[PDB]
Amino acid sequence: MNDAPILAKLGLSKVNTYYFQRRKHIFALPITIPNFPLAALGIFRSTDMFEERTLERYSRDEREKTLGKAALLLKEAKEKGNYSELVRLDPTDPRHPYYFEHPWQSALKMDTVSLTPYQQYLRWHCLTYRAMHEWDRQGLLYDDLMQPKALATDPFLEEAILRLPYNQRVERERRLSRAYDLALRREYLPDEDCIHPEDDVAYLHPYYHMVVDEHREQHENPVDVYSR
Amino acid sequence: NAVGGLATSQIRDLVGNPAKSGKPVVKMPPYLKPS
């Protein structure tokens, strides 16, 4: 990870949070249909390790990490006086407190000495499972496939898109239209234009996470118990 | 060189060629550098 050295000095782990993922519950509630009855309970689960895992953002550890990085930025601003600059970094900057990295952005240059055999399997799986879907041959980034729906829309997602800078929004739309045109013929880009895994940047996950936190803010500081 | 007492060419070079202000340059995020 490009963020790792910072995480190194805050006493955190240099390894992606994609590892350490674990099952803590038996039943998955609230039960959601249209799963089949037994599957609706969630006793037996099928995962490909590429789920969003958004609800795990409601943790004290993640907040501590975010505030540690923010405190580093504020300390630098106090020393130098470039506060403005340091609070307007692009969320793809490793110093931004909400920096997020896909597991494959560092799977090729990972330490791999501290990984459990299960975690080594996870690394190999991340690379190969990315290769299988062939969104890298469509000239597309993974976050381009995070799109909202007409009904049951993902609210955060919509906001996450409106926070993008104008040029990045336009580039996202243009990539999506090119992928649409390619998909008409089920065509791929020339083999030299394949997306390298380290180029598959997660440019929308920081905005997504910031929106999630801002939406939970008012819940934890209620005006009153029976308040909208 | 002087057309009727005027160094018109000189005047032209000083008056007839204003600079043209183009579109503002957009700084490219490092993750968009790949073509």
Binding site: P5 | P30, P34
Partner: peptide, 20 residues
């Protein structure tokens, strides 16, 4: 494709797409 902490872009490691 993201910059390092210093702000400079490093060279991508060699990569062969996984086979069938």
């Amino acid at each position: 494709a993201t910059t390092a902490v210093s702000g400079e872009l490093l060279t991508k490691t060699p990569y062969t797409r996984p086979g069938y």
